[PDB]
Design a protein around this ligand. Structure first.
Ligand SMILES: NCc1cc(CSc2ccccc2)c2nc(N)[nH]c(=O)c2c1
Ligand SMILES: NCc1cc(CSc2ccccc2)c2nc(N)[nH]c(=O)c2c1
Ligand SMILES: [Zn+2]
Ligand SMILES: [Zn+2]
Lengths: 364, 364
């Protein structure tokens, strides 16, 4: 396969469905990428993650650069070999996480490990992602708090764009990385239209393989997020993937696809007790499920719903058993993948708008 | 298959190898039974437990009678359906656990839940095991502390024998249970030969499908345990299974089989960091494994050793990841099953004594 090839097979309104071809495999879009925190998708073997239908997973750089360390993972053969996942892996730049879990400057960010002093710059972020063996590398950007004043949002966005250029050059100056991986730029600008436009223009001028909409899902609310996506997504190059970072609630995903987003990721799927169903989420810890012999969801095709009851999983979670987390997580990730499949098929068949309507009606 | 049929196919010295045929499946002996605490073998799906080679698992009655409750499990269809394990399940009587995790009397034991007031008697213990749908029911016995004076050991053993008779009658008075399950008696008597003899004689007079050697593995040390087994096992009926409760260290198992034991169980296999290998146990948390690309064990045929390195599992356990527990547990249970297979094959081939010798030499 080629290093990177995004092809759009069908469209409906702003929604698109297609594929991203990479050396390690094909990614069907719209896609949901399960998140692995410490070189592992919480409570699941890689084969199980694949069984749910995932084509790509997200690697949590921040934690990996601290433990076991980027250099160490490289010495061990790379993240793919390390964790046993041979398909595409997208890695975040680590900067956003650092400013959430820190001396900031135009050169980067210095911070103390939450679990020592560490320095992170656009150049070091790209190098770390290279050492991990990432297939999709994210540009190193600055976190823009919410709410943010227009002045602060502008300064942050402008810095991010300068860092986007440094990320591009660092990526290109490394032969092995430039020829085998892809690089995504990240749009910033808070909730301001003019800033989002400036960011999109700057990103397009530099040129990237894909464009992420960053700075959202920071407590603005779905209404506000959708409002921002309405004018923000069309600003990005149409022929490249659009990735909405950190968005995963089912209803958020459907609305985001309706607005042109092609890729998603979130830790929501992965012992809270919340299980997603087509009739809305349920918390399995609730006493009403203690003797419910039905599966988590009545239509779900996952292995958990074929073999165990709500009553059993209820018992597991309330007992604090590891198997409870294993089963809840497999079902949730399987549910998310089934949602993406329904979205892809509906778009391919030109009935996505209707699917969105039916989904919402039953989910709520 | 029949309700219960133990057949001895081959012998060498005091060691035996054969099968126990039951309605839900065949159990190969010597057998190792993985222990499931709360209706689950720690961090493993039932299919994975079976994949390791286990023919039967042990159900932890004490915890189940408290959560989710015996009556509830019965309402839900039984433990087999509940947890998704359709093969034989052996359940302990719960009395021993109660006196470890309490007003005692000739009628039974009253106690307060560690996680309310509850009463447990020989009759109630058998009923609980019936409600759980146990295939191999253990007689309700009294815990004999260690060390124990001859007088106290005698009183406890005598009470246990009276309770063994009550267990037998309770079991037989329940048609469905008597016709579909098996009942094992438990020998007591501490480390005293005369008491063990009295207990064995009492148990044989009553008549059981199998006989367990109880009261050992209570801090006496392998030397002392082996000394007690030397004279205790021959006292039990030769044509019925001999089950050593709570014994599982690899070397203990080999020595116990050399002394006539056919069944084992222990929580040792199931984030401590200890992984069993043919060259002895290792603690994966040790820094020396941080960049060790080799599998847990060089010969082990389990899925964990075929796919992941010590370095990765080291990272997982030190990071507190659930997958670490999943992988460590699967390997350990697989290792135990491989040990039992080597024991069974060596006995069948009349070279068990040699196997024991070679095992010890390399393990230590
Ligand atoms: N709060 C939404 C969100 C989430 C992430 C994290 S995406 C991620 C990172 C590591 C593991 C899994 C997902 C972001 N990352 C970057 N670089 N920029 C953003 O604007 C942003 C916004
Ligand atoms: N300390 C060894 C040991 C362990 C168990 C517990 S075996 C078990 C119970 C529940 C779950 C798994 C294994 C015992 N149980 C009974 N009834 N009698 C004993 O003498 C004895 C000695
Ligand atoms: Zn499901
Ligand atoms: Zn192994």
């Amino acid at each position: 396969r080629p290093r990177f090839s995004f092809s759009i097979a069908a469209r409906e309104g702003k929604a698109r469905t297609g594929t991203i071809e990479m050396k390690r495999g094909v990614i069907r879009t719209p896609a949901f990428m399960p998140v692995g925190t410490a070189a592992t998708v919480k409570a699941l073997k890689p084969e199980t993650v694949r069984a749910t239908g995932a084509d790509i997973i997200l690697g949590n750089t921040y934690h990996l650069m601290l433990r076991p360390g980027a250099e160490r993972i490289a010495k061990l053969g790379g993240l793919h070999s390390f964790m046993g996942w041979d398909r595409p892996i997208l890695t975040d730049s680590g900067g956003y996480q650092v400013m959430s879990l820190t001396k900031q400057s135009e050169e980067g960010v210095t911070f103390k490990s939450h679990l020592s002093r560490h320095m992170l710059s656009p150049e070091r972020s790209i190098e770390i992602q290279h050492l991990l063996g990432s297939d999709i590398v994210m540009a190193f950007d600055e976190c823009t708090p919410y709410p943010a004043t227009p002045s602060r949002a502008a300064s942050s966005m402008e810095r991010s764009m300068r860092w986007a250029k440094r990320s591009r050059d660092a990526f290109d100056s490394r032969k092995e990385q430039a020829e085998n991986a892809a690089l995504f730029g990240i749009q910033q600008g808070s909730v301001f239209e003019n800033l989002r436009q400036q960011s999109a223009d700057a990103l397009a001028e530099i040129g990237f393989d894909g464009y992420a909409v960053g700075g959202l899902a920071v407590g603005e609310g779905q209404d506000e997020m959708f409002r921002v996506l309405d004018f923000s997504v069309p600003m990005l190059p149409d022929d490249k993937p659009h990735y909405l970072m950190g968005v995963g609630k089912p209803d958020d995903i459907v609305g985001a696809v309706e607005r042109g987003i092609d890729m998603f990721d979130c830790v929501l799927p992965t012992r809270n007790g919340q299980a997603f169903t087509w009739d809305g989420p349920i918390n399995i810890r609730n006493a009403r499920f203690s003797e419910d012999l039905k599966p988590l969801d009545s239509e779900c095709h996952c292995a958990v719903c074929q073999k165990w009851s709500r009553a059993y999983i209820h018992h597991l979670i309330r007992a604090g058993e590891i198997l409870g987390a294993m089963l809840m997580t497999e079902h949730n990730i399987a549910f998310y993948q089934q949602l993406m499949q329904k979205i892809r098929d509906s778009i391919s068949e030109g009935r996505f708008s209707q699917f969105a309507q039916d989904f919402r009606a039953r989910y709520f």
